[PDB]
Amino acid sequence: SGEAPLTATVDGIIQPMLKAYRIPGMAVAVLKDGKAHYFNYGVANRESGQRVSEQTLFEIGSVSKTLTATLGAYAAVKGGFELDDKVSQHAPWLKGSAFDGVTMAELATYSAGGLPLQFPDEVDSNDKMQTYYRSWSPVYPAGTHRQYSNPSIGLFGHLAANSLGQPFEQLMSQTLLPKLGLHHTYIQVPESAMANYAYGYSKEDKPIRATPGVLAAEAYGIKTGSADLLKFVEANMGYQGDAALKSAIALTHTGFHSVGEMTQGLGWESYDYPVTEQVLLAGNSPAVSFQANPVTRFAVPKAMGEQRLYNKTGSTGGFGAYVAFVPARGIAIVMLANRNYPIEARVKAAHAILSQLAE
Ligand SMILES: [Zn+2]
Ligand SMILES: [Zn+2]
Ligand SMILES: [Zn+2]
Ligand SMILES: [Zn+2]
Numbered sequence: 001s002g003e004a005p006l007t008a009t010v011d012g013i014i015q016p017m018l019k020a021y022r023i024p025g026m027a028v029a030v031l032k033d034g035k036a037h038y039f040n041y042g043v044a045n046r047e048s049g050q051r052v053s054e055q056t057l058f059e060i061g062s063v064s065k066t067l068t069a070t071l072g073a074y075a076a077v078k079g080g081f082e083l084d085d086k087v088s089q090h091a092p093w094l095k096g097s098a099f100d101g102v103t104m105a106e107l108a109t110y111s112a113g114g115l116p117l118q119f120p121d122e123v124d125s126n127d128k129m130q131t132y133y134r135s136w137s138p139v140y141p142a143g144t145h146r147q148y149s150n151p152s153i154g155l156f157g158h159l160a161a162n163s164l165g166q167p168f169e170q171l172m173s174q175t176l177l178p179k180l181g182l183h184h185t186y187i188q189v190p191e192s193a194m195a196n197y198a199y200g201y202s203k204e205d206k207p208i209r210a211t212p213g214v215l216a217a218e219a220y221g222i223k224t225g226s227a228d229l230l231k232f233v234e235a236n237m238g239y240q241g242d243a244a245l246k247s248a249i250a251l252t253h254t255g256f257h258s259v260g261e262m263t264q265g266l267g268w269e270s271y272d273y274p275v276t277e278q279v280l281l282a283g284n285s286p287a288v289s290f291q292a293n294p295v296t297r298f299a300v301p302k303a304m305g306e307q308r309l310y311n312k313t314g315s316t317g318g319f320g321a322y323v324a325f326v327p328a329r330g331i332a333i334v335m336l337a338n339r340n341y342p343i344e345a346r347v348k349a350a351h352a353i354l355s356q357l358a359e
Contacts, residue, residue: 006032009356010039013349014335018042021341023320024201025052027226031237031325031332032357036230044198044338046207054227057189057197058336059211060321061314064222065153066252067185067232069267071168071176072108072160073248080163083108083251083301090159097134102142105301107156109256109264114139114292115149119214129214140292146259147292153267154215169217179245180235185224187217197223198338200318208318220316229323229334236268236310237327255304257295259288263304264295270308273326274358277351284313284343309354313347315340322346324354331357 003009010028018026018041025042038054076083081090083105088094090104102112115136123132133155139145161168166175169187177185189197199207211221239249255263255270262283263270271280282288304310306328314321320340325332333350 003356003359006030006037006357007039010353013352014039014041017341017345017349021339021345022205023337023339023341025056025198026335026337027052027054027056027058028336029054029226029230029334030353030357031230031233031330034330036227038226044196046199046201052198053225054230055184055196055225056336057184057186057193057223057225058321058338059200059209059220059316059319060222060224060229060336061211061220061316061319063229063312063314063321063323064218064220065314066267066312066323067172067176067222068153068157068218069108069252069265070180070245070248071172072104072156073251073266074176074245075160075164075171076104076251077244077247078164080160087112087155087159090163093130094133098136098138099133101138104156104159105256106143107152107159108266110146110149110152111143111257111264111295112138112149112152113142114145114147115152116147117149117290119151123214125214143257143297144294145292146257146264146295148289150215150219154219157218158215172217176245179242180232180239182224182228182232185222185228185232187221187223189223196225198319200316200338200340202318203340211316220314226334226336229336230332233323233325233332233334236325237330237332250303253304253308253310254301255298256301257298259283259293259295262288265304265310268310268312270304270310273307273309273328275309275351277348280309280311280351281344281347284311284347313343315343320346322350324350326354326358329358333357
């Protein structure tokens with residue numbers, strides 16, 4: 001209590017950043033004291049001049065991994081697979097491959113043994129994708145090294161959905177999103193929503209808007225606005241309803257290993273709260289996100305609890321997203337922009353805003 005108005009705090013941090021990085025538009029949403037607050041900046045489309053709101057659709061890039069993780073956890077709770085199962089128990093076409101020796105949990109948490117950030121360029125169809133995984137030669141023993149990876153969590157989501165007999169997009173759009181109450185969140189934006197879909201703006205300042213690629217849906221393909229994304233965050237701080245979905249959300253807050261001060265869950269990565277700016281920056285730096293690291297192994301997976309900052313970055317060619325929340329204090333920040341601007345800037349701004357929300 002006794003602070004300046006929330007609008008002043010947020011404007012004071014966000015406006016200078018939008019100028020510094022020439023960000024055309026940003027939707028910011030925060031949770032504090034049990035309610036949502038929206039702060040909308042600039043334009044979703046520079047040409048039309050359409051204003052950003054909390055209903056503007058942005059590409060959230062790898063923030064998608066948190067929804068994919070929730071879907072996968074849901075499928076495990078429903079009995080489709082065990083986190084402990086070997087991957088090839090859920091993909092006949094992988095029997096005999098290195099995936100005989102990797103678990104579903106390892107796939108989800110990027111610890112299979114050196115799967116890279118991106119597929120090679122030749123992986124451009126489903127057949128080429130299957131050949132890729134069948135041919136993969138691990139660099140590290142399973143469960144020992146974390147290397148942030150689209151092929152890894154992408155395969156996890158794909159196989160998790162199929163373990164329930166459903167394609168990923170169907171399970172997400174017909175089961176998970178409706179049960180979460182997310183009705184303006186899409187893998188493929190329907191025509192009725194296209195008017196709300198922001199354009200992204202590239203490094204060379206050109207309008208771009210698409211998330212093509214193999215397993216794009218699973219790895220980085222969600223379009224949503226700040227209001228739906230904040231509602232998903234709210235579900236991560238007290239969902240009630242479908243017992244299976246409640247269990248699934250709890251599993252996303254379970255830690256499987258750590259790298260430094262960061263603990264890897266399913267989708268969400270977390271830190272002991274309060275976390276310093278320096279630690280949050282380091283955990284989201286290329287030293288952690290763009291190379292293999294040996295993990296601190298956990299004897300067992302463990303619930304990380306409420307006194308944590310949970311977060312996820314996401315980017316595409318034209319977009320830059322960040323989400324962070326602290327369940328014990330009922331605070332959260334969502335920042336969706338239509339420029340892929342530096343993760344360090346996202347983290348510094350978010351940390352500064354959360355610090356104010358906690359006081
Ligand atoms: Zn307010
Ligand atoms: Zn709906
Ligand atoms: Zn609507
Ligand atoms: Zn090593």
